[PDB]
Amino acid sequence: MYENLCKPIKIGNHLVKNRMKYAATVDNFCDTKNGNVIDREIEYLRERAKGGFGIVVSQGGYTHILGKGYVGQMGLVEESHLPGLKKLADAINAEGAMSIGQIMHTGRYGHAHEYGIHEAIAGGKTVGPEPVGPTAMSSPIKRYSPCREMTPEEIEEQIQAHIVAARMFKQTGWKGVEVCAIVGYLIADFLSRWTNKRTDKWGGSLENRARFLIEILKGIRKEVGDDYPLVMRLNSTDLIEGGNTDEEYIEIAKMCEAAVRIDLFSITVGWHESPGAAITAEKRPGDWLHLADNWKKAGIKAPICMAYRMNQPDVAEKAVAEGRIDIWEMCRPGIADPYLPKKVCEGRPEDIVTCTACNQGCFYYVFIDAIMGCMVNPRVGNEWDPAYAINPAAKKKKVLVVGAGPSGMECARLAAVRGHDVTIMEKSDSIGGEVKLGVKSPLLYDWAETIRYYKAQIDKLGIKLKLNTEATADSIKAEAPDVLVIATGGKPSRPKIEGIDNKIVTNVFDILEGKVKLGDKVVFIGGNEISIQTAEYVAEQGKEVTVLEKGKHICFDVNIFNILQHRRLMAKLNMKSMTNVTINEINDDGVEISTAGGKDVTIEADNVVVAEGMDADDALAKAVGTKIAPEVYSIGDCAGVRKLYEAIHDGYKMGVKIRG
Template identity: 25%
Template sequence: MTAIDGSPGASPATPPALTRPLALRARTAPSRVLFGPHETNLARRREISDRHVAYYARRAAGGAGVIVTETASVTADDWPYERAPLAADCGQGWATLAAAVRPHGTIVLAGLGHAGGQGSSAYSQAALWAPSPVADAASRELPAELERDGIDAIVAGFAAGAALAVAAGLAGVEIDAGPLALLRQFHSGLTNHRGDEYGADRLLLTREVLTAVRAAIGDEAILSLRLCCDELAPWAGVTPEQAAEQVDALAGLGLLDLLVVTRGGPYSTTAYRPTSHTAPTFNRDLCAAMRTAAAGRLSVALQGSVVDVAAADAALADGVADLVEMTRAQIADPELVAKARAGDAARVRPCLLCNQACRVRDNRNPIVSCVGEPRSGHETEDLPVEGTDARARDALVVGGGPAGLEAARVLATRGHRVTLTTNDTVLGGALRGAAVGPGRERLALLVDWLAAECERLGVRFRFEKTVTAADLDAAEAAGTAVILATGSVTAGRAYPAPPDAAPVDSWPALSLLEAGTADVLPGGPVVVHDPVGGPVAIGIAEWLAAAGRDVALVTPDQVAGTLLSLTGDLAPANTRLAQAGVRRELRALIREVGDGRAVLEDVWTGARREIGCAAVVDCGHRLPREDLYLERPGTPRAGDCVAPRTALEAVLEGRRRALEVGAAAGRPRRVPVAAAAGTATGEGAGR
């Protein structure tokens, strides 16, 4: 067995604190781990769907003690994103969910809220409503000021939604007064400029809501409040000191059973669930202060990038909180609690805090998922990884990046005898290389986990091995299944440069940075070229600046790191670049490099200018490494050797190809090119 800290040894003498039960009013949660409300895009119309039910039930089966469903709007005019649930339409879905989780004993609460001025009018085609006409910092949309009849309708909507949830069989409800909520907007001097009683007493609406909800659900049901306790805007927003007074006042009502402590506001929404550039469990001190203010009158939950079992357990043991919200951690590994309870915490699939697949509130409407666990969000349609194929085979995986490692892991899990070869000296491929620079170190955790699982399952590794087409022919003749995961190569660059100023490709540059020195680049200004707008260039620029180099980031976009808007790191990344002294050369293309300078061209006007340049680190697109595939077209392949993309696609395709090995028993071993590329398997097949 494995100890809680991941070291070898016997099971812990006492179970981890997070696996212990917790009493909440008349109910008992089987563990102290909460799966919190978050956008999923799983709704059908505005209903809790069968996909929601399967998604939550999987976490309940994995040991989650409390689940709060995706926040449902309490009035129809609140439609913050296209697939946002509406409480009035969720009764049947809540009832189905209640039945599905009942065997596991998990407490399920319905998330209820109203987005107010931080919502959207795109779907309702109606004005937003807020405490005061203060434009939202993100959308810049100006809301209308709520009048008394509108306030009354919102209070009634909370009560009606709560009554419906409890009637459907849920254990209670959670009221949202967090970073994106109307109730928080009433609490804050940033957004509440009213001259009436709701301005004089900023907690008045929340008290009215809690009183109405308690009356609607009765004395036996659980009532939770998700409360923003620091808007990170001390000039007018809610501060921790003010929040402590609010917690004292609200706990004194005797209505609440649970308080979830959060942070973030209209100017800091990304602080709610930030990327790995923010240290995990960042709300420890804030939560401890609110627990002190609550003075034992209710249970308190720690929220804030709680993703590691040991850190969660320490927070409970130290009295920071009574339970821990581990939402992203349970998206990454639905069995987190079960593994911790069994003494196998080291086998919990790590959360990278990358927000790449689990942050889905954008206009593409992606389904919630996870880079390391692509079955998350697709529980109703995906083939399970668990199980043994009817016919065990020898299998050869060529490539040691995330695609190859996941393919090898799944093949071994299903009983195949697997050999993985790589021409490198270490495992991890591009993902290992990308785990360099401030806040990016967690990316390596997935590689380490995959490698450890492969080793545990008996996968044989062969390093510094170049596989040829003849090797593949011999393997196929012997009945060995083959999967190619050979990665990518540098693409040609569109600007001339003399040999002594040839650009350094991003991946070799990352390897150099991992070695711990920036001196391998020529002395003088370094230009980081980022035609992609992704995180790699940002990370390299930050690392070089921290090493004392003079850095300019060149991008054709109007803002550096455009794609980081999808993960919530766009504004924070640009703040970090400015603080590090990185010059951002925006709307620019590199046209020429040499003689200690780079010639840039404005993408709008064509005007040219020069900047100092002793070296270029090029973070442009790459091309698939397909030399081996072209010698044997039709061989199953996965990841960047199909088309260089992200770790999400690499892991997903590695899993799909591995599952196809079992399904292909008795059929010709080569598959059509389209299927090898992942286009013939269907949206959810083989996740």
């Protein structure tokens, strides 16, 4: 099947079994106190190695405390980090994967002070905990604090720290070393004309701006030797107004190959300060491949690998075939499904847990100093915890799952994988629950890949799927199961709003279910995630939409990465919104509201959508007590409304606990 993706390839002197690479992923799994590698991180990458990835890269390791940009970033500074580095390398090498250590000083994005650093040594002198860069300056956004200009001594020092960091990797069994010179970290800071305002040998012309990177490459090449694999990550476009152009990054790449032999180029897209889209669902697989074509036609000697929304094996396969790239790199797809490679080379892509790009468990959690997690993969960060082990339990109990939503299908999938006699009751004609409806939203198209997954596991696990069957207090008893899993989900709320009983009112479910004939002027009462996403679907059809939020901001329950995603879309669709508005009435023509200080104002509309919240659809659960079956359980939104992430987690936490 996926012949090209499974082809071998030599990276330097080391042969790689396939063309699938798991990219560096800082996940705060390391000890936040000192940057040492711990079991959580060891078992995390071990599973990615077991999964079949021909290459597994560690997270970006910080070469200096001032370069720590994540509360739990791996450290590459002192000898106290060697035991963990050797253990992690062996875990990856044992699985037949090429282990590669990444060296990453965050530079301008450092948060040493936020992590409790009062003072540090740099260039033989005491300094403050502020981040460092080639030029002292402030960030346009508040996340990154003002940086300090690096003395020429600190620059020479960091060249050595990279050399030493490469040594720590090689001497601990790592099969290769990767230099991280992307998205806005220290090296990228010197390469960019926007952040590098220096006039000495380290700044000015494109040659001087790239001197820092070249000296890091030359220094490491001498340290590791001509045989050791040396690769790097370099932007192909930084998406920064005033930064470097696409052809400049190509020229920089040429300079790197002229200085040392580059074994592999990982070309990236954008900076954390870029106002454009680089990794959100807005971008589809294959959109950035045109940048790879530029590097290939320009004569780049080393092979190239790319990622950034390349969550489709089909697209990657065609890419490797056409020579656009030489390796299919990926980070989020490797998080969502550690066994994606094994599933690809075994001709079973239908079993892939695809990445939806929710950016909640991975990007968002890591930037808020939290343990990384995954929406579709509840094992991320728990690969070490025996509580998530999947045990057989030869008893084989009879399990009845009520609700084919995400939580219900995750509970049944595992219970079936463990040998239980699972059955699912669905009152509708299709599985998916609210995911079946959200997939209609423009930015959630990936949710179709999720439906496919569960639809394929049910068909492969021989699970009893009873579609068009509304579970009642009688059918359950008739089925007489050993364990009852109630996953009815949630339903739209209906607050006490004068006139809410008017015909002009409708809820989210009816909209996405086509059980309503809307018009051209629509108004949504509620600025939460679900409400906004529903409006996007309404506007996509060519209709005027307005969102009314009583709170201070819209998209209040949206992660910081997706906030920028809705703005670009709500604006592209010409959508209006209002905050701090009081809902006073809903009549035939629309909804009457009031701002701060009276200011009564009507909103003429053809359809008013009450989408302020969701209610737990716990009707059935409360009708059948905990005595109807030897073991009764409620999971998902019916046991308390949460989001999709907490639903799949509840399902898997339930599928592995069904002992009897």
